[PDB]
Amino acid sequence: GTENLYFQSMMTANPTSIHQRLDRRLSGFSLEQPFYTSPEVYALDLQHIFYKQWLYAVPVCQLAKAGSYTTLRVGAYEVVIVRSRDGEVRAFHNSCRHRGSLICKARQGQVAKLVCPYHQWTYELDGKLIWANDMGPDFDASKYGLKPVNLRNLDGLIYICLSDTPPDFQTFAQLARPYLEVHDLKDAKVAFTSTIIEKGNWKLVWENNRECYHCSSNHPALCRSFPDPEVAGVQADGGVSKKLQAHFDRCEAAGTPAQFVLAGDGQYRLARMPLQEKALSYTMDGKAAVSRHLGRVAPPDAGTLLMFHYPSTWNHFLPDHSLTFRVMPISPTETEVTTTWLVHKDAVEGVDYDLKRLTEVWIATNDEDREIVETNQQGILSPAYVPGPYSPGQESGVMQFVDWYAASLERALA
Amino acid sequence: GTENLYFQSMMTANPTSIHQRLDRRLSGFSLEQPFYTSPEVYALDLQHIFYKQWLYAVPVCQLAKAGSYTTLRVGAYEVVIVRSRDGEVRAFHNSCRHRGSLICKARQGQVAKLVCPYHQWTYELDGKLIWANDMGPDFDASKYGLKPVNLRNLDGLIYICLSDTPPDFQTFAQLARPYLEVHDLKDAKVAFTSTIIEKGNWKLVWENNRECYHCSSNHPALCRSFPDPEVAGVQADGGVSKKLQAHFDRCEAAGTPAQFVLAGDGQYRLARMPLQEKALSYTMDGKAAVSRHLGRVAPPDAGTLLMFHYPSTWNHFLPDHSLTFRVMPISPTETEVTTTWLVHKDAVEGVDYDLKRLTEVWIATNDEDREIVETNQQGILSPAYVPGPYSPGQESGVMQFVDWYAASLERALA
Amino acid sequence: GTENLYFQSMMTANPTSIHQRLDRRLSGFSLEQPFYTSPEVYALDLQHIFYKQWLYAVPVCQLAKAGSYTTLRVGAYEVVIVRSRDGEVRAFHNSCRHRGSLICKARQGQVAKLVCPYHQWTYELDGKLIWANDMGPDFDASKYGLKPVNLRNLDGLIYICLSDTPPDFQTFAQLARPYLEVHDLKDAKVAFTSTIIEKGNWKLVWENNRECYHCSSNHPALCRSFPDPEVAGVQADGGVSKKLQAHFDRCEAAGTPAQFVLAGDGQYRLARMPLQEKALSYTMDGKAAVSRHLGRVAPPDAGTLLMFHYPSTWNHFLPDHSLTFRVMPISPTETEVTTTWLVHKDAVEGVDYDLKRLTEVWIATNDEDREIVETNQQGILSPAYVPGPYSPGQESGVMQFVDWYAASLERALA
């Protein structure tokens, strides 16, 4: 399948010549092949994008309990996120300072201390090394605490940054707070998590996400509740339609922030968009999936709070529940997408919601997107693939993403 | 197995130094290791051989119907071959000009138009882009038709060439026509297709094919019907035995071209050779597999029309049925071989032929060749492998192939 | 799992700069990441370590019979070891001198001659080419015998060396003989063989082996019979404890060599160490596994003859049976470990020993070590991994190994 096509295609590819490629790039066109297929560009994307920008990791409700921890891989990093004894959430490199071992092997759990499974070096939940067996009298444990990972809490959503010099997160955090706080995400629980691998480059997953040019043919279930190019894109940035604005006004008159806002540098966007017709949620019948709402959004037909933050996440926060999506790179032609359904912590499965009803729409959607992304990746692997033009009407959000990515890479290579 | 051996062997391999290796090559010896094992030479073989020469794709009878199409991968290219509305067979790159997607996902089918599954850009069966949704009023669809692939019809067998500057095909086509036309291949149907992966370099598959030095020990079934070094090789090029010539004369007196002919540059060869003993076909009992013949070959014991055309194909055309073989590179140590059994279009399975009887000999043979090729590849992966001498008597066809390959590569690197 | 982590980690790794890394290395610290993760260092480890030093292959009792042979892969080499007609054991490259094929496909067997399966070139059991079909009258078979592999017999254990210029083996052989001869290994048979792949670099397998810092937490079964840092390491090299020396004296008064000895260059070590408490063998109850002993070791509580010889082997020779361990590199993050249980040739399964009782302890131990090695490898793959300090008390044997490896590599690159 794709693994072999990947190998075949890179055999005859011309040199990456990344500066030349970046120089000649036009914003109205899809990217030249090696951006989507080459290990050279993939290495750059890790080094300069995923290892430098803030990334969505997990909802904070996953760390509700004392000594609770969750682990994730970002590229080659293995990160552990923990609720320390002081109630603070902190992140560390999941690598013992002795000989490097993973410390936490499970995806989630609770501990009293972080105990290396190899020789039992023992760390407090704030990373300090509190016991190391037989290291001699001049061993200085202060030099051998776990390495910290920069971490922020975005109103109930934990973000991390693998750089020692992280970019400004406060601008985004301040902008987003009014929109997110009404969802009370700190009072959520995880109802369901779905993790899939899509056999396409992470950028193809994002280009796919940033348009609904493909949705009428490809997403029967989603199309019952998700609408219009102005919804899914960014042409509302140059000015809002009267019908859309009336929706924003209904939300905001009711005390729910809605207005479309786009970062200066294009990194992130928030907008609370209307749903189709009379739909209220992402369900097959269009009605709320959960009877006990997560948050205080009003009115009931407030629709979907769309939030993207490149490179890691897109999100849908509805009046009754929320969904977060985490995009993580696996190889030049593979990307991991993790979808997390968030419901009120006291919402009871089988009473306030049905698992199938809650998840079926986006399970189906994700599978459809995956098939499309994978088909797109396979064609791109041809040596005959050349950039093609994006639709100005239907793909302005795709251009906006690709521009963000190219600018980010350019700045990092300067 | 071989995948790991491949990785191990390339770790310590000396530099490819391809010009030096080509310089010191002697025609009487097998090739130095990296020709058979290195990704560097494999990349060259794709770029300079498979992407530059004409290649056998499929029988034209697979495209008998209106709107019919078949897809194939050549290296990293994905090609679609289609019967257009004017009755002409044409080939295209199976990559949408929008964002690159595969258009035809199935191996075979029928369509009215080529409709991209992603955003439904729609193409006529001659590649023209006839509808693109919402591209703006200055989109010029004339610039965005599917990219054509050079295609020839060799008397019922479709050949393609991935280069914008294809080599001369007419010399071969003219030579071959008299031999092939008597098989009426345009009136065939595909009775059976077998696709296997052999874990050896494509050149090892060809060296294996071009001798019967290995056949008495390794091919019990084939040896009941397939003969003698003069059959399988090229020593008839310097002059024909009296017994072989008498066979050619029996065929040709009956109006069936037979005489051994070898290209100037060694690319191709045709000869109608006698079968063993009293055999008439490649079956366990030696009798015709199919009672309704494909073509008008006479006499009934005309034997096998051998045709090879490097790098893609060898073929056996018998009085009752025909077999085509397509060799396609998968990685430095993997090669795809596709065997196609062709019978008269009106021959009925279970009445005029039995599927098992028709296919069992060459299914077995291919499996035996595969085991041999794979065993050979595994030994070659050793760093202790050094070229060895070919048998002048039994491997003159192997030398002839290796000479063609080296000359072709030399010319392409000049 | 690890395969993908390997790929991710090498994408962003800094250049290998092997001389600089070797220059700055401190003996008290674990190695910088690329020693354990990079294909560049793995290639060096093959070229300069595994392809240059003597390596443990198999016990000679596996070649007891006339025409008997055994095959093994070392890196990319395929080696065949054979008992020739003169009774001598010899090794060859398992690659036919014609076109390179493997000759012996099975792991073990008996033959009269070595017959290539491809075109039946036939070799005597001392490698001479005695028949080649149809090679012409000026073919000189004297030039086309199998390529020999340097081979030594270490008191019943066959060692090989892939270099044309092997290092001195006699120093080790002379030192080891008194300790090994009392085990009568030439009179052994193989009771059981276990081959596992551990997903860590070969060096991580060795560092793991060379300490029991991890054993109390990780090896419940082994800890019932295997003891103390002085046992498993090398601090007895600077001087022996009174309790350990008393053990050596009990052995040696009984005519069984025991005293700790360490090579000048650190390559190898032999010591006959006491077992825990009252244990006599590696069994769950601590009693002898086999009632008919392999060899003449006395007293019955002589304990374990530990022998390591880098890079290929560690070994435990007990009064009742013996175990050999062979370490072979598979990729930068994979290593093959082969454990061989040796018992007296006349010991009868189900009468003198029970297979489960004999093997269960070290089957369990190996599986525990494997899990630990693999967990360690996964943490090391993080870009945040940095060298950490070894315990002077508990890891002196780890330092000693890493010093041997670094010195060996330095000398080979000079």
Ligand SMILES: CN1CCC[C@H]1C(=O)O
């Ligand atoms: C349209 N894009 C943005 C939202 C949904 C996604 C998709 O088509 O599934």
Ligand SMILES: CN1CCC[C@H]1C(=O)O
């Ligand atoms: C002998 N070669 C050429 C024809 C058949 C092939 C083989 O041995 O199967």
Ligand SMILES: CN1CCC[C@H]1C(=O)O
């Ligand atoms: C302690 N090392 C050396 C001997 C045993 C090995 C282990 O812990 O299994």
Ligand code: FES
């Ligand atoms: S690797 Fe963690 S204590 Fe040794």
Ligand code: FES
């Ligand atoms: S990729 Fe084909 S229409 Fe968009």
Ligand code: FES
């Ligand atoms: S490869 Fe061994 S005889 Fe030909």
Ligand SMILES: [Fe+3]
């Ligand atoms: Fe979609």
Ligand SMILES: [Fe+3]
């Ligand atoms: Fe064959």
Ligand SMILES: [Fe+3]
């Ligand atoms: Fe252990």
